[PDB]
Each structure stands twice: as structure tokens, then as C-alpha cells.
Write a protein that binds this ligand. Structure first.
Ligand SMILES: NC(=O)C1=CN([C@@H]2O[C@H](COP(=O)(O)OP(=O)(O)OC[C@H]3O[C@@H](n4cnc5c(N)ncnc54)[C@H](OP(=O)(O)O)[C@@H]3O)[C@@H](O)[C@H]2O)C=CC1
Ligand SMILES: NC(=O)C1=CN([C@@H]2O[C@H](COP(=O)(O)OP(=O)(O)OC[C@H]3O[C@@H](n4cnc5c(N)ncnc54)[C@H](OP(=O)(O)O)[C@@H]3O)[C@@H](O)[C@H]2O)C=CC1
Ligand SMILES: Cc1nc2ccc3ccc(CNc4ccc5c(c4)CN([C@@H](CCC(=O)O)C(=O)O)C5=O)cc3c2c(=O)[nH]1
Ligand SMILES: Cc1nc2ccc3ccc(CNc4ccc5c(c4)CN([C@@H](CCC(=O)O)C(=O)O)C5=O)cc3c2c(=O)[nH]1
Ligand SMILES: Cc1nc2ccc3ccc(CNc4ccc5c(c4)CN([C@@H](CCC(=O)O)C(=O)O)C5=O)cc3c2c(=O)[nH]1
Ligand SMILES: Cc1nc2ccc3ccc(CNc4ccc5c(c4)CN([C@@H](CCC(=O)O)C(=O)O)C5=O)cc3c2c(=O)[nH]1
Ligand SMILES: O=c1ccn([C@H]2C[C@H](O)[C@@H](COP(=O)(O)O)O2)c(=O)[nH]1
Ligand SMILES: O=c1ccn([C@H]2C[C@H](O)[C@@H](COP(=O)(O)O)O2)c(=O)[nH]1
Lengths: 519, 519
């Protein structure tokens, strides 16, 4: 019994794998991967065999692949004796006897040809699938990878990588299904003694055992459950936080009329070197995000300007009825007060109205941040805060993304940490992630660095009860590789960034999911 | 081949297990545990057997334990036929034939008697050890649990639990050692496909694959390495952060003359319901911690007051030469400036000197925090901050524990989140953990709640290079159960707390390790 694995790279949406006898893209790391995986073996005295259709054989230029043995499936091609590393077979089944002998052949790989893939799957010959998902979907394709039969489940999904601005994943599908329930927590199943003890200890003490307060998500609320030990894609950092509160979230009321399910003190990590963290399990409005960010950067507090750029999130907390209700009825229709941005560019500035000219008043943190970031990178005080005890009363809403710290790595990457006191996982969080990611990129370009990592620390992480069905739907979608975000020009001053300067490359999200805010 | 496990509870330091024919303590959850574990079986048609010395049999009052079969080892006791659930044997070896038959006996448990334990181990009869470590060590003992032979390695260590203010753990030792290197990362070893793929992907991309930037600690710098899937004790949250930077920490210079190894954006969790997070792998000065805390609480900035209470951490940054050096030479010998405490009780207050009377000036956050905490618990704005862009220049040192948020659980527990921009893992961190734990407890008592959980989010988590040998030593010590911290009286106002009011119960740390600070 030998192993038969499929190795293929197909576009994320339509599974395109070829065009006019060539790959529809050029990513060397993937050729490099293909080589590593199909060469990977245990017995130095054996070799792996790569099965492939004749046309694919033509693609390779009919030249052997070092250390391996190529098996071509063709009805015409002569069954030569010449090359000992290349052998021909008349049908796919007969070829797969590599098993039934050639104990010299350690592993088998179905290397391609829509025809050979489709047949390999149909005749149930393959055990595993190594799928490289490539993020370019509006180009011509004439060859495809068949749909993965249900008997196959994903067990791994790598983070997103970039090459020539093209995003791509690496995931492994295994043909499993001799099971039952099976625990999603990867910590269990290692050794019964630990599991039994923990369970019993769990029975004796209850809510007293901290672990019981942090129960692991039940399968039905865990995204792509089959990937148990390979949830490497960072979008799982958010999807899993979602599952975690759905599982442990305490039901509780709040200032808005809609109750939430919340847990306190959570974390999310996101790579920004090889991709941009814009959720794919739901379409996210990047323009709106951007427009709110430069708004902050400018130190603007006039909610009209946002409405004008057709961004309406601050309308609710900007309305005359809301301001009246929170004791700011003297305030104009959309004068949000000394909120973010005002604190960013004018910390402690004495606020009057959204019209006054604050040039010169207060402390300009953003400015200092940028200045300190490039003149003293290793410094441990690169901080930006919006929490001003003295201004709170005048704000239409207290700062949620309360404080952020920046770090310049030794390899000149710029990372960012953000502490968020309150976080609406269903509506806001997706936007916060993207927002601070962009801000970091901007700060990086301006200070001559490149994006590093983004870590987010949440205080009250919650889900509004009116988002339950939406988030359940979102959780049913398997993540796609993150897109790439690039600036079209090098701005000189951070506030010069314009929408046109931004490029969102390779974003292929699932349809948007409507979720209403609580005023 | 049946399984033979030892079940015992012994004091943390001298392994005392008995006194005048009784346990030297009374913890029901542990009796409850003993019952659960020794009853735990797969086959409803079989039973477990509990072997025990005659004296222990006397302890039980010579009455059978429901659902189980007691096997007494005695040279005198009559081999009756009466009770079918109790059977006598002349020597320990003969009794262990429970294996060689009684297929009705599913599992075996060596239940006690220093004599029987010692013999069970000596004759290599036991496969596993369930050890309940109890935290009371200055009481009389006449019976002990022998030292665990080296052939045994710990594979699990629970969090600490409390009963009548007595701390205790639960750990499992397994008699293993048919191995080799073995990876410490619990994520690996699940399925080769994932491991191989990740490794290869790791070869192709490099520092580009985020995972390679977060390498898992190498065994030689991982504390108690054998516990791979059971590092439940929360002291591992700190010990492991230590290992993590020792593994990935980037070497970098800083304001002080001593370079560090640092990583950015880390997290630590600590339970405060069943115990107090005062590290055990090194003796920590709780009094000093306390004295600095009320100092903050009082809004005091006079570093002399600390020196007077024989606390010297702020001396360095208080010296005349340091103040001169940072442009504060006009300042008096120990006038630290608008640091923590001043910002806590007088946010934005216009600072003069450590002598002026600031009563009434600035915003009193602590006061508001306490007020808001009890009048509006579910509120999502329970925040305390020390980061004041306008006062930084006057501070002898910018705030490290920058901002903290508080949360009141539905079950009336008070949890705390802290964001620390810079953290000296070797010298300061241990103290910060304890410090904020205490503060939370104080805030809780005053607001009528009880401690919940403590989560700490670090920005620049680092290790000064002159602490490497010390921390390596610390890492060689296996954690002991956390102690308990209790207040002797209910204070009416948070600033009324006095050292005498505090009780540190059951703290049994390893000798203190001297580690010098960088000015
Ligand atoms: N992205 C990826 O991972 C990969 C992409 N590709 C791409 O796919 C395209 C090549 O594949 P595709 O066009 O399907 O062609 P394939 O490589 O499958 O080759 C088809 C040929 O294989 C032989 N063959 C197929 N089925 C049988 C059968 N049942 N019995 C006998 N012989 C059979 C036939 O050759 P004969 O006529 O001589 O009898 C047939 O013409 C290229 O564009 C290539 O770049 C290829 C591999 C991987
Ligand atoms: N903390 C924990 O987990 C536990 C604590 N304990 C405590 O330990 C104490 C009891 O243990 P300890 O004093 O050692 O007494 P033990 O229970 O070992 O009993 C000793 C007796 O067992 C018989 N025995 C022992 N060895 C042999 C042998 N080699 N051959 C034949 N008979 C043997 C003898 O009885 P005989 O004279 O009649 O021949 C001997 O007097 C109590 O204080 C009890 O509370 C007990 C179990 C667990
Ligand atoms: C995931 C994946 N699967 C594949 C399966 C079959 C393929 C067949 C042809 C090609 C493109 N054509 C060639 C043609 C020749 C070679 C390689 C690819 C790869 N390759 C090297 C690897 C590339 C390198 O040297 O860096 C090898 O050792 O196999 C070749 O010599 C790609 C795939 C992929 C592919 O590109 N990616
Ligand atoms: C209960 C609640 N209140 C808020 C009040 C003000 C906010 C300001 C900013 C953000 C985060 N930033 C953005 C920035 C842009 C959009 C959204 C959020 C949400 N959003 C909606 C559209 C606008 C809307 O929902 O009204 C969407 O789903 O596409 C945006 O376009 C969230 C809130 C919340 C929030 O997330 N939740
Ligand atoms: C970890 C551990 N191991 C032990 C091993 C042997 C012991 C022998 C005697 C006693 C103390 N004496 C008695 C005497 C009688 C009973 C129990 C304990 C426990 N027990 C219940 C459990 C207690 C309960 O009912 O809650 C049982 O089902 O076994 C008894 O009937 C404790 C241990 C421990 C022990 O207390 N803890
Ligand atoms: C480089 C550096 N500088 C500092 C400057 C001021 C600090 C103030 C408070 C704390 C954290 N709080 C405490 C509170 C009490 C003690 C210690 C730290 C350390 N510590 C020493 C004794 C005093 C000393 O080291 O001088 C010990 O190891 O026991 C204490 O007694 C750390 C620093 C650091 C710090 O941790 N590292
Ligand atoms: O960037 C933002 C803006 C605010 N909110 C949400 C969080 C809360 O659901 C609500 C504020 O609630 P309070 O903190 O005011 O109670 O707005 C976000 O999630 N992110
Ligand atoms: O509560 C505290 C007081 C400060 N420090 C340490 C952290 C740094 O090692 C040093 C301050 O360094 P800078 O942030 O000033 O660079 O003091 C702590 O760890 N905890």
C-alpha cells in the first residue's frame, strides 16, 4: 500500500490551472514547492513517481525531473526503454501498479492534466491533495482542476504569501472519514490520562477551573472544522475569536438597546508582510475604511465630511437626537467633538466646535510618532493614544481603539499593537483590523519601512444578538487567501494619501453580509 | 497487561502525606478527585482495584469503597471470604497478579502507605503517578511519599486551586523514556503531511513565513519540557514567554547601556479566582510590590517615601545624576514627576514639585473608576491610563504599564486587562503581574466583587543580556502551586490598605535569584 497524492495549483474561484499549454501565472516559490513536495521521501534508496498526462509532459519540455520518475499517460507516445526516469502507460489505472511493485517507488504523485486529475479522483485513486490556491481570477483559462469530491476534507491552510503582488495559499486535503464526533480542541487526544484528569477536575470544580470559563468552540460554530492542526491562515484569528465568544460569551445588556454576548481580554495576530488582512469570508468596504482613516489623520472631527464621501458610520452617533440624549444638544448636527484625530493631532487641545481652526493647539502625537519612529526606531515609546480623561465628556463616543504602540524590527519592518476597550466583532472589528493595517502601512512608507505584524488586544470582545444569524452564515464560508494592498505613489506627508493612491489586488471575498448597528 | 497507577497527595516541599493515621489536611475536592480517578473505568462489567497498606485500610475505617475492590497488604490480617469487595494479600508482589487474572479488574491503583508506595516504586510496579501537591509545609508529618524515581516524567500540571485558603495542584507523572529528541511544539506530530509541508514551505520562504518569526522554544530553554500537552499551571504563561523571547528575541540596544533580546506583542493570562499569581520559580518580594502600589494609589510621586519603606526600585531613575541627564536637573533629589499615581489621581494636573498639595487638581481616574465600577458594572469604559502626551517630558520615566481596563463578569468577578508598552521580563514583569493582581483585588473588595482574571498584553517584551544566566537557572525549576493572598479586613476607602492587612498564605518559592537593573 503506497500513497497517492495530487499536487496542483488552481485559481481561487474557478480553479483554473492552465492556458494554452502553460500555467496562467508565474510564481517560483510554487514551482519550488512543487519540487520540494514531490521530491520529499524517507528512503534514500527509493524514488517518488510523478504521473502526468501527455500534454503536461509536453509542458515540461519532455525532460525528466531530477531524482524522480515521470510516468506519462498517453495512448500514442512510444513505450521506450531509452530514458529510465521516464516511463509511458496506456491508461491511468495500469500505471497505478507503481503500488503493486517497484518497491523502489516510495510515493506516488498525480501531477496533472485536467483529464488525469478528473480521472484520478473519479476512480478513487488519490489519498491526498496538495492545493496551491492562486489569487488571480479575471484572466483566460482553458484547463481546470475538478471540484474536490466530498470524501475529501481540508486539514491545513497556510497563511497567505505574495509574489509579484499575487496572493496565494497552500492547503492539504485528506481523504478521511472513518470517525464520529471528534473533539475540535487540538490539545485533547494527546494522552487519555491528561484528558480524563482534566475532565474529572472539570466536574469537581466548575466555573472554578479557569479552563471551564474558556471552553473550546463546539464543532457547529467552528469555521472549517476539519482543519484542526493547520489553521495557519490568519483570518482564523478573527473567525476563531468569533467562535470563542459564541461558545463562552456571557449574555449582557449595554448602553445600546441590543444585548451582546461577550468575553473579556482576547487577542488577534495578523501578518502584513506577505498580505493585507481584509477578511475574505465577507466582502469588506475598503474605501469607507480608508476615508475614515485619513479623516482621523487630518485631525478632522466633522462628521459631515464623512457623509459627503458617502461614509455613514458616524451618522448614528452624530445625529441631533443622539447628541441631545447624551447632553451635547448645544452641538451642531454632526460635530462629533474631540474624538479620535482631534486627540491624534491635538491632544489636550481645548475643543470649541468642528469649525474652529486648531492649527497649533494641543500635542501632535501623530507628528511626534512619525518623527520619533524614524529618528529613534529602537525606542520603546512609539505610542499613540486617544484616551483623554479630560475630554471624554465632550466626545460623541469614547475611543474604542484606545491606544496603539509601534515597533520597528531589526529588519526594518514596522509592527503595530492596538488595545481596543470595546469591540463589535460582527460590525466594527473587520474594519478596525483593516484600518490599523493601513495606518501601519502609511506610517511605514512615510518613515521608510515596510509593514511587519499587527496584533490586536481586545477588552470587551462581543457579538450583538442581532448578528447571530449573519455571523453563523459567515462562519460557514471557508477562507480564501488574503488580498494585497499597495500604494501607487510615495506620498511626502502622511496626510497627502488619497483613495486613488490605493490598490487592492486580488480580493475575491464571499458576498457581503448585511449587519445593522445599534445606536 | 493491566495499568498500575499511584494516587497520592503530598505537601509541596517535603512530600508529607500523613500524621497520626490521618491526612495532614482536609480538602474535599481532593477526596472527590481521588474517588473520580480510582473509579474511572471503560468496562461497566469490570472494576478497578485499590491496593493499600493495612494502616491505610485502618484509615478508611475498614469499610469498602463503592464500585471498587480494596486489596489490603498485611502479614496478619485474615484472608477472609466475607466481604467480596475486600481481599487480603501477604506481600505486594503477589497481590499484583490482579494483572495475571481477574479480567474483571480493569485497572490497578496503588493507594497508599509510605511503605506500599516506596515498595511499589522500588519493584518497578507502577506505570503512572497522580500527585496532588498540597501547599502547607510547616506542620507535623510522620508519613511521606518517596521521591519520584527519574524514570518518571511529569506530563501534566493543573492550575492552582484553593480550599480553606490552602493551595494545591494536580499533576500526572508517566513512566516514559523510549524516545529521542521529540519536538516540544504540541502542534507537530499530529500528521506528517502538515508537518512536512510546513517545513518545506518554511524552507522556500524564510523569515517571510510568519511562523518562522515565531519559532517554538527549543527544549533546552523550555521549562519542565516533559509537560507538553498539560502546561495548565498559569506560571507557564510567564515561563513560556521567557522561553519565547530566548528563542526569537532580536538583539537590540536601548536607552540603558545594556542590550536586550526582544519580541513585539505578547500575552499572559492569570487566574485570580483560585490563587494569586506570585511566581514560585523564584522568590518575589511581595512587600515591596505592595508598598509601590499604595504609593501609586495615593497619587504620591515622592521617591523618598519608597526609600523610607525600604523599597529602592525608583532610586535609579530618581537620582540627581539621572534627572540632570534627562534635563530635569532643577528637580529635587527624588521628585520623580507626574508619573503613575499622579496621573491616576490627578490626570492632566499641572505639576510643580512632589511637595505641593494637588488635592482637587486634575482628573481623579481611580476615584471615577471605582465609582463607575459599582454604579455601572456592565459598562465598557472602565479605564485607567497613565499615558499623558503632555506630561511625558516631566516624568523621570514614561509609563510602562500604560493602560488598564476593568471588566465585571456576570457572576460578579472583577477581571483586569493591562497593556504594557515595555516590559523587563527578568526584573520587572514578575512584579507587574503581582502588582496589578493586587490592585484588582483591592478594586474588587472596595466595589463589592471578587477577583476574576488577569490578562497582560506586552508591547516590547524583552530580556536584558545580563539576566541570561539568572533566567536560565530560573527556567530549570519546576513550578509549585501558586499561593493565596487575602485581606485581613474590609477597608472602606482603597487608600486605607496597609501592609498588615495582607496575608500571603502558602507561598513556597525557590530561592531568590539576584538580577540587576539597568539605569
Ligand atoms: N496548475 C497546475 O497545478 C497544473 C497545470 N497544468 C496545465 O494543464 C494543461 C495540461 O493539461 P490538460 O490539457 O488536461 O492535458 P493533460 O496533461 O491531461 O494531458 C492530456 C493527455 O494525456 C493523455 N490521456 C489523458 N487521459 C487518458 C486516458 N484516459 N487514457 C490514455 N491517455 C490519456 C492523452 O494524450 P494522448 O493524446 O497522447 O493519448 C491526453 O491528450 C496545461 O496548460 C498545463 O500548464 C498541468 C499540470 C498542473
Ligand atoms: N496523602 C495521601 O495520598 C495518603 C496518605 N496516607 C497516610 O499515610 C499513613 C498510613 O500509611 P503508613 O503509616 O505507611 O502505613 P501503610 O498504609 O503503608 O501501612 C503499613 C502496613 O501495611 C502492611 N505492609 C507494609 N509493607 C508490607 C510488606 N512488605 N509485607 C507485608 N505487609 C506489609 C503492614 O501491616 P501488617 O503490620 O498488619 O502486616 C504495615 O504495618 C496515614 O497517616 C494515612 O493517612 C495513606 C494513603 C494516602
Ligand atoms: C502546486 C503545483 N502543482 C503543480 C503540478 C504540476 C505542474 C506541472 C508543470 C508546472 C510548470 N512547469 C514546470 C516545468 C518544469 C519544472 C517545473 C514546472 C518545476 N520544476 C522544478 C521546480 C522548480 C524549480 O527548480 O525551482 C522541479 O524540481 O520539479 C521543473 O523543472 C507546474 C505544476 C505545478 C505547479 O506549478 N504547482
Ligand atoms: C454598536 C456599534 N457602534 C459603532 C459606532 C461607531 C463606529 C465607528 C466606526 C466603526 C468601525 N469603522 C467602520 C468603518 C466603515 C464602516 C463600518 C465600520 C461599518 N460599515 C457598514 C456600513 C455603514 C453602517 O453600517 O451604517 C458596513 O457593514 O458596510 C461601514 O461602512 C464602528 C462603529 C460602531 C460599531 O462598530 N458598532
Ligand atoms: C490524591 C489522593 N490520593 C489518595 C490516596 C489514598 C488515600 C487514602 C485515604 C485518604 C483519606 N481517607 C479516606 C477515607 C474514606 C474515603 C476517602 C478517603 C475517600 N472516599 C470517597 C471519596 C470522598 C467523597 O465521598 O467525597 C471514595 O469514594 O473513595 C472515602 O470513602 C485519602 C487518600 C488520598 C487522597 O486523599 N488524595
Ligand atoms: C531597567 C528597568 N528599570 C526600571 C525602572 C523602574 C521600575 C519601577 C518598577 C518596576 C516594577 N516594580 C517593582 C517593584 C518592586 C521591586 C522590583 C520591581 C524589583 N525589585 C528588586 C529589588 C529592588 C531593586 O532591584 O533595586 C527585586 O528583584 O527584588 C523590587 O523590589 C520596574 C522598574 C524597572 C525595571 O523593571 N527595569
Ligand atoms: O472602531 C470602532 C468604533 C466603536 N465600536 C463599537 C464597539 C461597541 O459595540 C460600541 C461602543 O460601545 P461602548 O464602548 O460605547 O459601550 O461601538 C467598534 O467596535 N469599533
Ligand atoms: O512597572 C515597570 C516599570 C518600568 N519597567 C521597565 C521596562 C523597561 O525595561 C524599562 C523602561 O524602558 P524604556 O521604556 O524607558 O525604554 O523599565 C517595567 O518592566 N515595569
Amino acid at each position: 500500500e503506497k500513497n497517492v497524492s495530487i499536487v496542483v495549483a488552481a485559481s481561487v474561484l474557478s480553479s483554473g490551472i492552465g492556458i494554452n499549454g502553460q500555467l496562467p501565472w508565474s510564481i517560483s516559490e510554487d514551482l519550488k514547492f512543487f519540487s520540494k513536495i514531490t521530491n520529499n521521501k524517507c528512503d534514500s534508496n527509493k524514488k517518488n513517481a510523478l504521473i502526468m498526462g501527455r500534454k503536461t509532459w509536453d509542458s515540461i519540455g519532455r525532460r525528466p525531473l531530477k531524482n524522480r520518475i515521470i510516468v506519462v499517460i498517453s495512448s500514442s507516445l512510444p513505450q521506450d526503454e531509452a530514458d529510465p526516469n521516464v516511463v509511458v502507460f496506456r491508461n491511468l489505472e495500469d500505471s497505478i501498479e507503481n503500488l503493486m511493485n517497484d518497491d523502489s517507488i516510495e510515493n506516488i504523485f498525480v501531477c496533472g492534466g485536467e483529464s488525469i486529475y478528473r480521472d484520478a479522483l473519479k476512480d478513487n485513486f488519490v489519498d491526498r491533495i496538495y492545493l496551491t490556491r492562486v489569487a488571480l481570477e479575471d484572466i483566460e483559462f482553458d484547463t481546470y482542476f475538478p471540484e474536490i469530491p466530498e470524501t475529501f476534507l481540508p486539514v491545513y491552510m497556510s497563511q497567505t504569501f505574495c509574489t509579484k503582488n499575487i496572493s496565494y495559499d497552500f492547503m492539504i486535503f485528506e481523504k478521511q472519514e472513518k470517525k464520529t464526533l471528534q473533539n475540535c480542541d487540538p490539545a485533547r487526544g494527546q494522552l487519555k490520562s491528561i484528558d480524563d484528569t482534566v475532565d474529572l477536575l472539570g466536574e469537581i470544580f466548575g466555573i472554578r477551573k479557569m479552563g471551564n470559563r474558556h471552553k473550546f468552540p463546539k464543532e457547529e460554530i467552528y469555521n472549517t472544522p476539519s482543519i484542526r492542526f493547520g489553521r495557519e491562515h490568519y483570518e482564523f484569528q478573527y473567525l476563531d475569536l468569533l467562535s470563542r465568544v459564541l461558545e463562552n460569551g456571557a449574555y449582557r445588556e449595554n448602553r445600546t438597546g441590543i444585548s451582546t454576548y461577550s468575553i473579556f481580554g482576547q487577542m488577534m495576530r495578523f501578518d502584513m508582510r506577505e498580505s493585507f488582512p481584509l477578511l475574505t469570508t465577507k466582502k469588506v468596504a475598503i474605501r469607507s475604511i480608508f476615508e475614515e482613516l485619513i479623516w482621523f489623520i487630518k485631525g478632522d472631527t466633522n462628521g459631515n465630511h464623512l457623509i459627503e464621501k458617502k461614509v455613514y458610520i458616524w451618522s448614528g452617533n452624530g445625529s441631533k437626537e443622539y447628541l441631545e440624549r447624551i447632553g451635547l444638544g448645544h452641538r451642531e448636527e454632526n460635530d462629533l467633538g474631540p474624538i479620535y484625530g482631534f486627540q491624534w493631532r491635538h491632544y489636550n487641545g481645548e475643543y470649541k466646535t468642528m469649525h474652529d481652526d486648531y492649527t497649533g493647539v494641543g500635542v501632535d502625537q501623530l507628528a511626534k510618532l512619525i518623527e520619533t519612529l524614524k529618528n529613534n526606531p529602537k525606542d520603546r515609546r512609539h505610542i499613540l493614544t486617544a484616551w483623554n480623561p479630560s475630554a471624554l465628556s465632550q466626545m460623541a463616543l469614547p475611543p474604542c481603539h484606545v491606544l496603539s504602540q509601534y515597533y520597528v524590527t531589526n529588519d526594518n519592518c514596522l509592527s503595530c499593537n492596538l488595545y481596543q476597550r470595546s469591540c463589535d466583532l460582527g460590525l466594527g472589528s473587520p474594519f478596525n483590523i483593516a484600518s490599523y493595517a493601513i495606518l501601519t502601512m502609511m506610517l511605514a512608507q512615510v518613515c521608510g519601512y515596510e509593514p511587519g505584524e499587527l496584533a490586536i488586544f481586545i477588552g470587551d470582545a462581543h457579538i450583538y444578538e442581532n448578528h447571530l444569524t449573519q455571523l453563523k452564515e459567515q462562519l460557514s464560508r471557508t477562507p480564501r487567501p488574503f488580498p494585497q494592498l499597495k500604494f501607487k505613489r510615495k506620498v511626502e506627508n502622511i496626510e497627502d494619501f488619497k483613495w486613488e493612491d490605493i490598490e487592492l489586488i486580488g480580493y475575491y471575498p464571499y458576498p457581503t453580509i448585511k449587519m445593522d448597528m445599534a445606536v
